Amino acid sequence: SFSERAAEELIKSWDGKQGTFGAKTFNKSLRLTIRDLLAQGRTSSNALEYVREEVFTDITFSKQTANVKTIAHWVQASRQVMDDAPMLQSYINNRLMYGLALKEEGQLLNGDGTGDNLEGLNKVATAYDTSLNATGDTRADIIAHAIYQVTESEFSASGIVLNPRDWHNIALLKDNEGRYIFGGPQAFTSNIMWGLPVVPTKAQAAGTFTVGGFDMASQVWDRMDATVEVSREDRDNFVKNMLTILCEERLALAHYRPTAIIKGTFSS
Amino acid sequence: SFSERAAEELIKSWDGKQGTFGAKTFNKSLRLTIRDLLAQGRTSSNALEYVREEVFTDITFSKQTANVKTIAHWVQASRQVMDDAPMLQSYINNRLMYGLALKEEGQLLNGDGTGDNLEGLNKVATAYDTSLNATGDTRADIIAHAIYQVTESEFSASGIVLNPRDWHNIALLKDNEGRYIFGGPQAFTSNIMWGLPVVPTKAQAAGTFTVGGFDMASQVWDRMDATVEVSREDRDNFVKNMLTILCEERLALAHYRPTAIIKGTFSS
Amino acid sequence: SFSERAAEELIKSWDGKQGTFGAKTFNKSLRLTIRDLLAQGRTSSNALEYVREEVFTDITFSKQTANVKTIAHWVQASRQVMDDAPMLQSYINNRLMYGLALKEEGQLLNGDGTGDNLEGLNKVATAYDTSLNATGDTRADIIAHAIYQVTESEFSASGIVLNPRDWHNIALLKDNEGRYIFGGPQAFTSNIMWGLPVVPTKAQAAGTFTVGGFDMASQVWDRMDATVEVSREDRDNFVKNMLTILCEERLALAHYRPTAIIKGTFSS
Amino acid sequence: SFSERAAEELIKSWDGKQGTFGAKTFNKSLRLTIRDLLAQGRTSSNALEYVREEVFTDITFSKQTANVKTIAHWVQASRQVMDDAPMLQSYINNRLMYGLALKEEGQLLNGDGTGDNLEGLNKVATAYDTSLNATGDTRADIIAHAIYQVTESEFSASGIVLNPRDWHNIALLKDNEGRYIFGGPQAFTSNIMWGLPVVPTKAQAAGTFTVGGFDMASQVWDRMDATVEVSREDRDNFVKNMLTILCEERLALAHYRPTAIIKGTFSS
Amino acid sequence: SFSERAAEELIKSWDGKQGTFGAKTFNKSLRLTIRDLLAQGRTSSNALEYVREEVFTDITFSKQTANVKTIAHWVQASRQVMDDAPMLQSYINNRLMYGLALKEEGQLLNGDGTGDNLEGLNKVATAYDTSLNATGDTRADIIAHAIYQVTESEFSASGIVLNPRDWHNIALLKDNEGRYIFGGPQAFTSNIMWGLPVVPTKAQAAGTFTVGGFDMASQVWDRMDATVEVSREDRDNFVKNMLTILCEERLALAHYRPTAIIKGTFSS
Amino acid sequence: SFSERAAEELIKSWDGKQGTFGAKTFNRLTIRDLLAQGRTSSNALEYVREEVFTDITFSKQTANVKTIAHWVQASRQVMDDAPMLQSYINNRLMYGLALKEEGQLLNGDGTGDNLEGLNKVATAYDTSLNATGDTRADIIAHAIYQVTESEFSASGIVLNPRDWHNIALLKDNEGRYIFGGPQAFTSNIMWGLPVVPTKAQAAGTFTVGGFDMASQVWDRMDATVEVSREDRDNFVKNMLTILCEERLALAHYRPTAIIKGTFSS
Amino acid sequence: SFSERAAEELIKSWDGKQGTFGAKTFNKSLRLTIRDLLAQGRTSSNALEYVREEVFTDITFSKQTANVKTIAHWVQASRQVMDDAPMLQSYINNRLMYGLALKEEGQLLNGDGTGDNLEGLNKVATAYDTSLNATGDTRADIIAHAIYQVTESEFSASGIVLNPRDWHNIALLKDNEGRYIFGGPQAFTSNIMWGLPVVPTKAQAAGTFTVGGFDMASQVWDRMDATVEVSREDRDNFVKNMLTILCEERLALAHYRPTAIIKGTFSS
């Protein structure tokens, strides 16, 4: 049990103001988040060299590099934790993992690769071929054309990324008699469109969509060497008599075939 | 001797097709080279993260990274070289190592830091302040103003890099009495100008000079793990019984204060 | 080797938060710096008392105290430096020691009696007597009048302190005959003005000079208790996820006869 | 000492008409001579296989072979030399060695590949591209153009070979006002033009120049197994009743890039 | 070391109120001082008989005597200095010894025969003959006439004694042309005039000079039996709750030919 | 040291009125250190001088051994105090003797108990060697040349300290020193030749020569100290006399190798 | 010591009226002289036979013989000198050996092969080719043309022989501006002209120069068996009643290539 190992080595290491555990990856098996769409890799080096494939729609090749960058998230806890072991375990849970997942989800989608940032999916992605658009298309038809444009890369699509307002407008969309185009409220099964998972995320700017062969075209490389640390600490954030629980991990993103990721905007 | 140990272990390890010697480094003591002017460091990592210092001309700081690049040189030979250790040594110094020294010295001095290149000294260097020039100054007096300008970084100058043509046209120079400034041919040999080492090299373009606090402004980081290797060419074509000999080393260059390295040109 | 011992005790003392090594002095009580001009003393106490001589221009006396203050310099290094001991030795080097020497050279020359500052040589210094100026005098001739003025204290002068701009303009100065006063740029290097040592330093304000009997006028009192200390930190809002390496020592400065130090400004 | 051991083994081995001493070459560090410009090598076989590079003016490769050829120099002495060992030591001296260094310099420079001869640098050399000339070029400007043409091989020049009449007329060149241009007689002695070694040699024909990447483009291979030999003889038919002292060595010359050696003639 | 031996015996002997060390004279086992111009000698009695020489302007002889007087200099230090031998050594230094040199120099130059004083050079000295002066003579020309007047004693001058203002205004002497007559600030520092040592000293009154055959005509006699001592004290009422460190020595002065020493004053 | 052994042997050999010590010699550069050295056990010596036409001619000469002597007056109780007698017989007495041999060797005459000195035998500087605009430094260079006409080479320059202070701190028209700053005047070297700056040389006079080959000091050994009480020293004024002295001859084999001159200005 | 041994054997072998000590060479084979420029050799025979090379300006040859001749020099001493061994040692000194050096220098330079003389360097030498002289050339510029003319022999120049007047006139040469053209008295001392040694000697006639490859073109053959000798004598009508001290050595000079020695005369 990850949370019981974590709680045990924190209380065993705590000196009275600092404690630590070696949580080698937070990723299980190494809504959906952006990192659940991508492939996973494991590394002992701070930099990675890889061969990118460029497609003409033939194959050409080039050397690329990715450097490991650090992602960190923290929560404040009652100082009653850290002698009560099963209270500590109830903080090392789904909210601590979901907070870190929302932090990497912004770097993997949007990052401009200079300085402290990762290289983002939206930076490398191919432009949507608007010549596919036809009279009578809905915004749902524009996604169905983008799923086709992925196939020019040899690979096939595996997920869709949207802003939460655009997914709300798409799902409530109505045919001319006053009937839902997804079918009525008791039917459709949350975040699915044309049989692919949707990731509706705040990182995706409004009016923008992204669809791609994410399980094949790109890979998250995890440095291992992730940690949970706990401290008594001074800050501008209600530090009266509290602990801060901090967890952090080191990642890189390798884009093997950027023709298999399509970025577009809706016309309206 | 290094060439003796290399040539011996190359024949001792040789199969019909592959041989190897693992050199710790090609740098003796882990004219002067450009590498003899800079500071030395050792690392296990593929990349270094460091902080650069910018001086207003009170310090400002930024994160930088240097990836450990590979510097390599190779020679074609014939299978007789593996039958004759004197003949191997004659390639493992007079051909291969003489070619690698001029290879790394062009990277450390001139590397435009894209792709497989190091970022070299002449790319980070600060321009010579031409406003320092005075009425009737010589090419020697331009070097004095640049030795002054290095001190605006808090560091003193520690070496001067010239083309051998420009060093000859400086060393044999007389002041207007009819007397040498530095000395006769005994100043062109024994490469010292005003008590600072001169490095005369083909890598410095004619008419360009560089002066700096090199032992304090920058450091070479060496991965260790250099190799000399011999391989049978199954490539054949027109050339029968072909053998390739290769040596390579892995380096990064870190520039901590580029204000301490001045680059300029002589007017003619 | 100091660097090799300091690395051993930094990794052996490391808690995953701090590590410490004791230097019984860096050097200093085993170009020149301001500390080379002054006399040296060794002390086992954190405060000290002394008598100050006050020359009439007979001897008046007063009682003074000096408190031992801390002088500190730091370098930022990557978190991996504690995982690789040759990478630690590669940072415990001459650039660390020269940086502390440039730090104390600011306190010894320009410090104040307030907070953790030392009392600086420029605060106790007596003014230059401009009644000594003759017609057609230069910035060089003004230093000769100040070397005379030090003799009114019963002491002869032992050195001169200038900004690098001011030393450059003095050394490269031309006489009315169209030729150098001091010899050429061979005299800007090898820092001597009329047999006295020149200390050209970025600590000294532009247009200000100081000349004095420094080894008879004042003494640096050294506590020993110098340290190299390593930490995870993020303060002064510089750089994130970085290790700090700190070297520091404890010093007092005593001024026994302030009449033997002259300060002035060049009007030219 | 060499002259001691040679004289002892000559008188020890002597029997009525011949005697011999074996020496591992006469080249130490195993004006300059031609053999000082070239790379050195050591070999245990009377033939060598090597790969030449051609440059279009991209790279191409061809097999070549060099066969080891004999070079010998002799001096005549009176027969009393074999009965007075200090008189032998007085003939085994620097004049005997410098004669062999002058004998091989004619083969390395002008030899044809036929019979008992080396293939020399002037045979393989690329012709000077006379399209580079202008009306009003001096003989020194023609050398500057030839130094530029070496770069089209991707190597750079390392020496210049001239006749002594031609070096004298380059160096001692007087201007229209009666001053010296290319240095005075201080350039003719201590042989340097533009920071490159000049080899003024009577083997080079008058009106002919050669310049190239000699340190990189060609190599001299020495068999070891050289000999000092003494004989009763009456060949050449000059001098009767005499003793012959002979020193001889076995060499091959390998040219790896003939595009890097430029040969031409002056206008005048 | 002297400071090591002095401090160790002071703390060994201290007994809560008085410490003593027997320094058998201070370095005279043998700028300059008056004691460096004169001859030296070693005495075992406190009264001293000697013979003087008078010169008519043949030699005449007369009985004379000198009495050994005491010269003493002191420093005040904090009470902790007797509890820390390194801190005691930091006060037994060159600043202590240079203080006695200033104390003895006023006794040797100006002293009376009366009381605890030595009879000084300015008392025995012959008056400068003003008939030697000529119209518009400089202060240097007066010194030249006075150097000449010493020859009337048969001896020749061996040193010149001036006030620092008078030496400054002799050396920095600048003509109406706007340039130095006597060699300027280089002549002022490292004090030589006409191949004789200048001793610029505060003991010499402004406007007054002394010149003589000091090395031949006069001798300092040293008793041995100097001391370094330490006490708690409250004489002269200056400073309270302080330790006093005393160095004292016993000297006499013998004058053998007073005609060889000239005293005068300047015209202008 | 000498004066250690001399003082204990004087206070020991002393019996009321007489006491005496003898030694096999007492010992910037001195004039004596420029010259060749020889040891002799005779009170006169015969030698041949070489005169060079500027062919060679020869003549007979004699080097008579002369005593060089210095004496001082002291009160009788110096014999009661060994470190005080020692202070006389080196800081008063032995210093003045070294100043006195140097004036004999430089500029004595053959007459009486004098040595004939270097400046007495020396040949005149040829003023026709001077070019227009020559300095005092350039006059030394011409005199270094003029020694070579003797077949010997120059080996030292003898100056007054005034003249050496002028020449050492001499600047060319670029404003650089011709020799150096304090390392010209101290470290007594001019163009690799030793300088001897001595008070015995008249101001404005110079001497340059082949001193190590042109001349030789023949040393007799047996240098001495005597203490005397005998005359009106004691029986009116209670004094005594201390005298110390050494025996030398100087032989000049080739005077054409020694050049004497005076500066133009 | 040599003088210890020479005196101790002269006094021991002196019976009645003559005595002798045997030596080898006077330490050649244990300013520069003419014998320092030449090659050395050692022989047990009183005649030597050798081949001379002649050159067109192919190598032609002729046989030669050289006969050992005596060089002798004497000093006259008093008859006292054999009675006092320290006086004999005082006469066996450097004034004697430098006398012999000046004696052999006059034979080796100027001798004619007739009678008791050697064949000298100036008799065999090649004439200076006055066609080399250019407009506006100084006497120094003529010596540079003669340094070139030596190279036509296949040898480089190794020294220059001048009369001392001519060397003074060349080194102290003054420009129209009143400054030294060659560099002045610092070049007359330290006998170097363009890196070649100068030998100024009274053996060279005024207006004549000689320049050659002396160490490669002629050899002094020394018989060993030299002597120091003492005799009663009366001859040449100079000096009477006087002892003679004589030293002598046996030499031959072999000229292997007279084309390498150049002799000429200055125009004025």
Author numbering:
A (entry chain G), B (entry chain A), C (entry chain F), D (entry chain B), E (entry chain E), G (entry chain C): 76 to 105, 131 to 157, 173 to 383
F (entry chain D): 76 to 102, 131 to 157, 173 to 383
Sentences from the paper on this structure:
Tailed bacteriophages and herpesviruses use a transient scaffold to assemble icosahedral capsids with hexameric capsomers on the faces and pentameric capsomers at all but one vertex where a 12-fold portal is thought to nucleate the assembly. We have determined the portal vertex structure of the bacteriophage HK97 procapsid, where the scaffold is a domain of the major capsid protein. Assembly of this large complex from hundreds of protein subunits requires transient association of an internal scaffolding protein or domain that acts similar to a chaperone and is absent from the mature capsid. The mcp gene 5 encodes a 103-residue N-terminal scaffolding domain (mcpN) and a 281-residue C-terminal domain (mcpC) that exhibits the HK97-fold including a triangular A-domain; a P-domain, composed of a long spine α helix; an adjacent three-stranded β sheet; the flexible E-loop; and the N-arm.
An initial map with icosahedral symmetry imposed was solved to 3.6-Å resolution for exploring the global organization of the Prohead. Our focused reconstruction of the penton vertices had sufficiently detailed side chain density to build a 30-residue model into the spokes (inset), which are composed of residues 76 to 103 of mcpN. This segment of scaffolding domain adopts a helix-turn-strand motif with residues S76 to S88 forming a rigid α helix lining the interior surface of the capsomer subunits, followed by a turn, and residues K92 to G97 adding an additional strand to the three-strand β sheet of the mcpC P-domain. The final model reveals that the density is discontinuous between residues L105 and R130, showing that the N-arm region is flexible. Hence, compared to Prohead II, the N-arm is not visible and the cleavage site, K103/S104, lies in a rather unstructured part of the shell. Our higher-resolution cryo-EM map of Prohead I shows notable differences with Prohead II, including visualization of ~25 mcpN residues bound to mcpC, displacement of one end of the spine helix, reorganization of the P-loops, and a complete absence of N-arm density. Our data show not only that the Prohead I P-domain is constrained (the spine helices are bent and even displaced from their positions in Prohead II) but also that the P-loops at the end of that domain adopt an arch conformation, preventing interaction with neighboring capsomers at the pseudo-threefold interfaces. At the icosahedral threefold, the P-loops interact closely with each other, but in a manner different than in Prohead II, probably because they align with the long axis of the Prohead I hexamer skew axis. The scaffold C terminus binds to both the spine helix and to the P-domain β sheet, which suggests a potential regulatory mechanism of assembly where the scaffolding domain locks the mcps of assembling capsomers into the Prohead conformation, thus constraining interactions between capsomers to specific sites that guide correct assembly and shell closure.
